[PDB]
Design an enzyme around this catalytic site. Sequence first.
Site, PDB file in Angstrom:
ATOM      1  N   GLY A  31       0.799  -1.208   0.000  1.00 33.98           N
ATOM      2  CA  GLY A  31       0.000   0.000   0.000  1.00 33.98           C
ATOM      3  C   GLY A  31       0.834   1.261   0.000  1.00 33.98           C
ATOM      4  N   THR A  32       1.871   1.281   0.833  1.00 37.50           N
ATOM      5  CA  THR A  32       2.753   2.438   0.890  1.00 37.50           C
ATOM      6  C   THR A  32       3.493   2.623  -0.421  1.00 37.50           C
ATOM      7  OG1 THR A  32       4.320   0.960   1.955  1.00 37.50           O
ATOM      8  CG2 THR A  32       3.050   2.394   3.343  1.00 37.50           C
ATOM      9  N   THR A  81       2.665 -13.158  -2.363  1.00 38.78           N
ATOM     10  CA  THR A  81       2.575 -12.988  -0.927  1.00 38.78           C
ATOM     11  C   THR A  81       1.303 -12.285  -0.499  1.00 38.78           C
ATOM     12  OG1 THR A  81       3.588 -10.809  -0.709  1.00 38.78           O
ATOM     13  CG2 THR A  81       5.050 -12.673  -1.059  1.00 38.78           C
ATOM     14  N   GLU A  95      19.884   9.258 -21.702  1.00 37.38           N
ATOM     15  CA  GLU A  95      19.860   8.571 -22.984  1.00 37.38           C
ATOM     16  C   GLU A  95      18.758   7.533 -23.087  1.00 37.38           C
ATOM     17  OE1 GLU A  95      21.868  10.013 -25.168  1.00 37.38           O
ATOM     18  OE2 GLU A  95      22.000  11.131 -23.281  1.00 37.38           O
TER      19      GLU A  95
HETATM   20  N1  LIG Z   1      12.290  -7.952  -4.594  1.00 32.46           N
HETATM   21  C1  LIG Z   1      11.946  -7.730  -3.334  1.00 32.46           C
HETATM   22  N2  LIG Z   1      10.625  -7.545  -3.014  1.00 32.46           N
HETATM   23  C2  LIG Z   1      10.269  -7.319  -1.737  1.00 32.46           C
HETATM   24  C3  LIG Z   1      11.218  -7.270  -0.745  1.00 32.46           C
HETATM   25  N3  LIG Z   1      10.592  -7.031   0.420  1.00 32.46           N
HETATM   26  C4  LIG Z   1       9.267  -6.926   0.185  1.00 32.46           C
HETATM   27  N4  LIG Z   1       9.058  -7.118  -1.146  1.00 32.46           N
HETATM   28  C5  LIG Z   1       7.779  -7.054  -1.849  1.00 32.46           C
HETATM   29  O1  LIG Z   1       6.963  -6.077  -1.249  1.00 32.46           O
HETATM   30  C6  LIG Z   1       5.630  -6.343  -1.606  1.00 32.46           C
HETATM   31  C7  LIG Z   1       4.665  -5.857  -0.530  1.00 32.46           C
HETATM   32  O2  LIG Z   1       5.008  -4.572  -0.072  1.00 32.46           O
HETATM   33  P1  LIG Z   1       5.902  -4.472   1.246  1.00 32.46           P
HETATM   34  O3  LIG Z   1       7.220  -3.837   0.904  1.00 32.46           O
HETATM   35  O4  LIG Z   1       6.072  -5.841   1.842  1.00 32.46           O
HETATM   36  O5  LIG Z   1       5.086  -3.547   2.262  1.00 32.46           O
HETATM   37  P2  LIG Z   1       4.686  -2.091   1.759  1.00 32.46           P
HETATM   38  O6  LIG Z   1       5.281  -1.832   0.405  1.00 32.46           O
HETATM   39  O7  LIG Z   1       5.140  -1.081   2.772  1.00 32.46           O
HETATM   40  O8  LIG Z   1       3.091  -2.104   1.711  1.00 32.46           O
HETATM   41  P3  LIG Z   1       2.280  -2.231   3.082  1.00 32.46           P
HETATM   42  O9  LIG Z   1       2.618  -3.530   3.776  1.00 32.46           O
HETATM   43  O10 LIG Z   1       0.814  -2.174   2.758  1.00 32.46           O
HETATM   44  O11 LIG Z   1       2.644  -1.070   3.964  1.00 32.46           O
HETATM   45  C8  LIG Z   1       5.565  -7.843  -1.829  1.00 32.46           C
HETATM   46  O12 LIG Z   1       5.105  -8.081  -3.132  1.00 32.46           O
HETATM   47  C9  LIG Z   1       6.991  -8.328  -1.740  1.00 32.46           C
HETATM   48  O13 LIG Z   1       7.285  -9.127  -2.847  1.00 32.46           O
HETATM   49  C10 LIG Z   1      12.541  -7.457  -1.062  1.00 32.46           C
HETATM   50  O14 LIG Z   1      13.386  -7.416  -0.180  1.00 32.46           O
HETATM   51  N5  LIG Z   1      12.910  -7.688  -2.360  1.00 32.46           N
HETATM   52 MG   LIG Z   2       4.333  -2.512   3.959  1.00 37.43          MG
END
Ligand SMILES: Nc1nc2c(ncn2[C@@H]2O[C@H](COP(=O)(O)OP(=O)(O)OP(=O)(O)O)[C@@H](O)[C@H]2O)c(=O)[nH]1
Ligand SMILES: [Mg+2]
EC number: 3.6.5.-
Lengths: 52, 58, 426, 434, 436, 97, 95
Positions: E143-144, E178, E253
């Site tokens: 969401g963020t 996830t 570029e």
């Molecule tokens: N490639 C990669 N994807 C990640 C990693 N950590 C989290 N994600 C991705 O992040 C997505 C979900 O968002 P999150 O970063 O976990 O949490 P958020 O972006 O803050 O969103 P909210 O939980 O609603 O606050 C998932 O699809 C995960 O695949 C990472 O270390 N590497």
């Molecule tokens: Mg999050």
Amino acid sequence: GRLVAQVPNEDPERLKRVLDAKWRTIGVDKETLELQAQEKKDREQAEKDRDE
Amino acid sequence: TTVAGGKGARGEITRRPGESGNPYGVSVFVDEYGKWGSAIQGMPLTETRARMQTKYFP
Amino acid sequence: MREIVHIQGGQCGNQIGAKFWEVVSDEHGIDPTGTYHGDSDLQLERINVYFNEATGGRYVPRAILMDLEPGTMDSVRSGPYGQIFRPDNFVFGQTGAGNNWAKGHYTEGAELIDSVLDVVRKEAESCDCLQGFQVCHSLGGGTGSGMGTLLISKIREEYPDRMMLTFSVVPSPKVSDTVVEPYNATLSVHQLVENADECMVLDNEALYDICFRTLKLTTPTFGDLNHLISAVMSGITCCLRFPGQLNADLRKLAVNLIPFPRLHFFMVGFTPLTSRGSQQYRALTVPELTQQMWDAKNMMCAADPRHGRYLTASALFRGRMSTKEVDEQMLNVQNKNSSYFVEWIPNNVKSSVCDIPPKGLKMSATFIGNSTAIQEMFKRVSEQFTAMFRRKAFLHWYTGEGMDEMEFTEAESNMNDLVSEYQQYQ
Amino acid sequence: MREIVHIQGGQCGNQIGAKFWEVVSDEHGIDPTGTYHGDSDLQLERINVYFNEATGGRYVPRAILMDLEPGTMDSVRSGPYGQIFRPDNFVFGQTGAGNNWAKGHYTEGAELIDSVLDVVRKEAESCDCLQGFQVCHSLGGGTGSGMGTLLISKIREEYPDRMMLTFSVVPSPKVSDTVVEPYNATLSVHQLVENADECMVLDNEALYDICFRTLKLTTPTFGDLNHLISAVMSGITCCLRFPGQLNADLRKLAVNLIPFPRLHFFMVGFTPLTSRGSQQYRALTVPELTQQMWDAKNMMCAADPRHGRYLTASALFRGRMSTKEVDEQMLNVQNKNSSYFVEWIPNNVKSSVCDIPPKGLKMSATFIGNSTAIQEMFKRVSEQFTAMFRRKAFLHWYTGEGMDEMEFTEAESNMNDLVSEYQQYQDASAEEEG
Amino acid sequence: REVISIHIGQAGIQVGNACWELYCLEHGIQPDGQMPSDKTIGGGDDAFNTFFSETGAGKHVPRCIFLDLEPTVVDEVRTGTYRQLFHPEQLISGKEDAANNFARGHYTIGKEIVDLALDRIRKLADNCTGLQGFLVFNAVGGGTGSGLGSLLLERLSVDYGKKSKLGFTVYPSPQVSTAVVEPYNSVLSTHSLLEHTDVAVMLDNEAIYDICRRSLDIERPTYTNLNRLIAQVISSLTASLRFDGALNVDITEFQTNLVPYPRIHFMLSSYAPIISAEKAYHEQLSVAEITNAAFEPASMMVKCDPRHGKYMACCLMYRGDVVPKDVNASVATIKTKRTIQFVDWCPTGFKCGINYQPPTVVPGGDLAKVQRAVCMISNSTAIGEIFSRLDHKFDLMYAKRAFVHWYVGEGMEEGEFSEAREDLAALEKDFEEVGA
Amino acid sequence: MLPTDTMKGTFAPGTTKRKTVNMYDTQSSTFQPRPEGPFEAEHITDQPAAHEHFDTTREIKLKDPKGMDLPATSYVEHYPPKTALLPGEPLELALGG
Amino acid sequence: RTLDSPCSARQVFTTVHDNQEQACILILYGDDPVASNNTLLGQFDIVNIPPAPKDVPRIEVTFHLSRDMFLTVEARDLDTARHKRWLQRGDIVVL
Ligand SMILES: Nc1nc2c(ncn2[C@@H]2O[C@H](COP(=O)(O)OP(=O)(O)OP(=O)(O)O)[C@@H](O)[C@H]2O)c(=O)[nH]1
Ligand SMILES: [Mg+2]
Ligand SMILES: Nc1nc2c(ncn2[C@@H]2O[C@H](COP(=O)(O)OP(=O)(O)O)[C@@H](O)[C@H]2O)c(=O)[nH]1
Ligand SMILES: Nc1nc2c(ncn2[C@@H]2O[C@H](COP(=O)(O)OP(=O)(O)O)[C@@H](O)[C@H]2O)c(=O)[nH]1
């Protein structure tokens, strides 16, 4: 200055600073910054000690 | 001799008084200040913070 | 007396010019610190053509570097023969065009060209009597092509009677760096046919080919290609810089190679170019020079002249040589392969001799042959420009920058009738 | 014989005058403590233009400081070459006008200017043959602009026949210090068009531009700006102080540069100015002097002379030079760039040479161009002045003092008629009369 | 030349924590802020100017802003090894997360975080002088990352507009996932990612799992290893700005040479040689094989098959001991081979770039010291395939109106669901006609 | 080569209070010249001996603040004292009668 | 004379004989332009001036006078950066 003039217009220490373009752009007195950080931490610890 | 092309590795022209890599020291002329990669060439950078106001420049 | 003001445009232009000034400074014996250390007096008497006496034997080149990115300038002042230029002559932008002819011709030139024209005007009115300006640039990039063409236009409007050379590297399809090569090359050539006096066509495909077959190197870095184009530029201007038994300046070669005011794109070939392993197993005679010079694989363009007709040709020789053998060899090559030479122009070969060879050599040559096989490469570029513009690929990067589509229609129509008139005279 | 008295007004004027007296004392070889220790006899023979022999080689400058707060005076005293000024010439008030032209022209000037006039009289009759008064001041402040201009008026009523130079820096909107700068500058220029014999227009914007591009200094302080202005003034008066192959006094230059009694605002420039790192690359010839002298980026005003016409021009040279080269260079400049020169005056270049260079060089040049591009700056000031006077902003600080609105109306009228005169003379026809 | 990097989301901060670890190690900066005491001033220093400024004396604070809504990961940064690297303010932290909710992150909490973030960015750009562009890191699943990430890009495009904004986004994988609401999140993020990021590079997580399983033969990789090689790619395409090369390619570029239409900026990426410490010793690395190795779907950073696609364009970053000769010979062999096909609009469908400095190594990383490497960024129609794959299973859940009440409760409606779905349909039509 | 190396001059105190005390007061600090002070080297007991020591081979002059030497004025350089060239021996023809 | 209590004044001097070894600085108190007439207070010299032509090497002589009239004299040869300080009624220090 327009009101009062204590310093010379070619004083060496003032000129050495102003001429050092890096000192004009960013200037610090790291020792005093350390001392003041420790002073802040000590005041917080004194507060917590008083509450204890 | 192959000469590196394009940008990168900021050189004698982009070097200026106020930036994030240029060393301390007294300099009156920008083109004089512009060659510390030429003048200093291998001192330890503790010495540059030590000798804040000193020429040691072209 | 007669002067040459050098002008470099673009990143490839700067690296070309850095090596060019390196070999010319070596030719006149001036050291990388900038002082004269020659032995012959003949080196000293003709350096007003390229330098200006500053102080205590300090000679600064009569050049103007021009581009839009500081890393090129830093690379100029890093290498040897980098502290010999005057910093004022480093007229220089700050944003960067980046493979955008439109940025290189409408948006950034508007604020850069005033300062370049101020510098080049200062460099011209410094010396007394200009012979001509010289321009090295690229036809692939943005700041080289766009700003180059705008500079050429502004200069030709300001100083009409003065001569003008242009060394342009046209991109090849086999050796393709950028993607917008056609959109730049076609638009630039459009401006080039109407403003430049004459041009000499280079391309990196033929340069890699020559360094592969003749020089026999494993790793032909850009420095060696820059070395080849440098030896070409030196060979062009040798007649001014040194006395000779038969002289030929820029204007003399121009009138003797340009029969029509739109046919001024020449191909180049330099000789001798031999690998150092095979450097000893060869003789040094003018048939040995002409067998390699008239060889079709030695041309510095991707236009095989055997697929067309040698309209005119010229050869500039260096070294104390025999005019009789020189002229007799030209006569023989003209008469044997009589099909490759045009009919309605007898004696299609201009020739000149300057008795001072390049350092390390005793006898050399330079070839400038105006053929009609150059429309092969222009067609090769024009068809890709059509393949993209037919349904507007990449078009918005120029359309939103001030351009209209009619500029593209103009560019292709002028490409069209140019290759048609080259095909006509074939 | 020929005499120049110096009058400094205000803080900027005072600092400029301090640097100027430093450079002149260095040129004539007198130590900071005031005694002569030079080498050549060419130094002694023409210091009567600026000094008086006091006692055994003691020479005091012929200057008058004038301001309202002891800060400036003691900054003058604390500086080197500061013990040479006579303290009776430190005529001086202690209230402060504070960027108020009305205060500098009606309240405090009204009682300080009589003492200032006593001092300047005394120092003017201390000599035999006055060449001119030389007034250095600014156009933004109050103690320099208002008091200085009232002094100019009174002096022009007293001694009408002698020469009068005014080095005046003008406010520019790019680098603008105070807020009432247009209110001050408009009235000051109104007075200068009617009193001053000639005014040389400077500005800190062009000074900074020069120090950035040409000199390529890292920290262009007011000391360097004042050094530039001082070198300009020294190049102006080198002809009186040193023998040359072609002399040019102040009155000579004025009569050769002023075609009409109201068109006497000149743009100035100096040559050569190169960086210490780039001086190795440059050639040193008369062409290398003139190509930089006539350059647009070397003028010391914020008015590109390419935007108008050169009414007249003048070039003073210092150092041993070949007059043939000098004349043919002037000829080339006048012939080639031909449209920038007015038509109804042929041979628009007055030139002169002297054989003594400024310190540090062998040869140098000073340029004084009377162009018609100055109306650019005058309009640039007048538009701000009328924008503010459209609603009597900041106006009570003058109205409650004795000034009226008619003064501002007259200032606007004279300024606009001045720029109209300039425009008509710029676009005037070549040959026809009525 | 300065470029500032902003990270939005819990994946953004983790990616940033890998990138900045690599940057400090590449420029020799210690984790506590300043260089080693023994370091000697020399040519090639000041190379760090494009990422760090120099505060005070001997302190380098990056040009970055981590920002998240939950204070957890930001506090992990504040207590980790790099306590003294980042300035305290640069790590913007909210009070409560959006919790997998584009609506909550776009209209509820973003409205109070966006002003503080863009007020920080403005004084980062004001400190900067030669700003190349911004570059954003986010995962569109959360969401963020998605919600206020869109809101940030909106107001960034309003504040500056012309400046380039590199978007390295992380799309959710087709089969390994996830979340559940992620299709709604991805679509509602994309509709704003169309008209705002100038260049957008897709990164899926399964593709990287495949790479780390096959090539690096790590059988149990956590997110750190994924973050490690993603930072490797970011470093490889910013090395042209940083260090001098033979023929280098800027940020500005890509827009010129990889965006044939102003609504098509979606670029597959790849990297080679992604290699381990044992295979590297055994196998000789040369330019031709790694130019081949960067082209199979077995080495791409997105789970898609360009064999079903047509390469619109290609950009090749080379690092290390690479001469222009063989890179030219290699792209010659690719262009003459017919296992892949280029589109008709591009006969010159390549753009090469060469840099000298070899890519560095990290303690805790899995790649060994390699002499030369390739980072490819191409463009094809396989992305028009992956958006339809995502669209179909968005329509699945939207047909039964699952989870819709969450977003309506946050204050939205059905209108923007419909228009976002239609915008994806329009872009689908856009990709199928360009590929024609 | 710093600009502060060439900086000559004599500085003075700036703004300050009025003096309000004459130098005849015992608390007013005054500069007393005698005793002689710290002489350097042996045999410099007397002022005349100091003068001979100063005159032998030590000496100092103040440096020319101008960098170059003063150029000779054009008049003096162009018109130096000159001597006319010698005529030469004339032929005399013997008259004939 | 008549300069206020806190006062400093520096000048630059040079040797007059070419190839000179030492330079003898004499401190005199008085008003007479002839030197032998003024009274003398302290003298010292800068030793080991490197060989050079007539007026090349630079010596800086600077007088400083403090508030309760203590006088110090600093002589600084620029080339070898040789500093010698002379204090009224107290030994000469080198640096
Ligand atoms: N490639 C990669 N994807 C990640 C990693 N950590 C989290 N994600 C991705 O992040 C997505 C979900 O968002 P999150 O970063 O976990 O949490 P958020 O972006 O803050 O969103 P909210 O939980 O609603 O606050 C998932 O699809 C995960 O695949 C990472 O270390 N590497
Ligand atoms: Mg999050
Ligand atoms: N001979 C030579 N060709 C070059 C060089 N650099 C680039 N090129 C060729 O020129 C084209 C790119 O020029 P470019 O760098 O974009 O010029 P610019 O960006 O406008 O300054 C490509 O086709 C390259 O193959 C060089 O140093 N030497
Ligand atoms: N060149 C120069 N200009 C100065 C200096 N001090 C002030 N100025 C300029 O003077 C203008 C203001 O004039 P002001 O000082 O108020 O004059 P005054 O108060 O009447 O003496 C400002 O625009 C400054 O830029 C200086 O030391 N040198």
